[PDB]
């Protein structure tokens, strides 16, 4: 399925994912696409920062959903 | 000064803050108003997660700015 991953600064990308993908797996796809290290990524859905070892299905993330990506880097 | 705190798929509130307030101080004000424990709050500006020991002025957060709030639950 496709999801959208959007920053709060208005940048949107699409990703191909499966319900059984972990949030960590999604971070790995974002790193492949955009170069951002997983430790610098925080993914958000339903107002909550998502736990890395849980899956998209665990969070009831549906096709065409938007996840938000927040960056985390010391001094930024 | 007044700032807004918006939770991503939830509510918007106002807060009264000072430029010298630390992010930890702002979390405390959100707890006073909303009951959310500070350790579970993550505040966001310019697309990134803010750090507890830095102040609003450190990020050039000014009057009528918006901070986004997301929740990081206990384990």
Author numbering:
A (entry chain A): 1 to 76
B (entry chain B): 1 to 75
Give verbatim excerpts from the published study on this entry.
In an attempt to obtain the structure of Lys48-linked di­ubiquitin (Ub2) bound to the Mud1 UBA domain, cocrystallization trials were performed. Diffracting crystals were obtained, but subsequent structure determination revealed that the crystals were solely composed of Ub2. A new crystal form of Lys48-linked Ub2 was obtained and its structure was determined by X-ray crystallography to 1.6 Å resolution. Despite these different conditions, the same set of hydrophobic interactions and hydrogen bonds were found as in the previous Ub2 crystal structure. The new crystal form reveals a new conformation for the isopeptide linkage, which interacts with other isopeptide linkages in the other subunits. The isopeptide bond is in a trans configuration in both crystal structures, but the carbonyl O atom of Gly76 points in opposite directions, which imposes a reconfiguration of Gly75 and Gly76. A new conformation was also observed for the loop between the β1 and β2 strands.
Ubiquitin molecules are assembled through the formation of an isopeptide bond between the carboxyl-terminal group of ubiquitin and the side-chain ∊-amino group of a lysine in another ubiquitin molecule (termed the distal and proximal moieties, respectively) or on the substrate. Lys48-linked polyubiquitin chains are recognized by the proteasome as a tag for the degradation of the attached substrates. Most ubiquitin-binding domains interact with the hydrophobic patch of ubiquitin and thus the conformation in which the patch is buried will be referred to as the closed conformation.
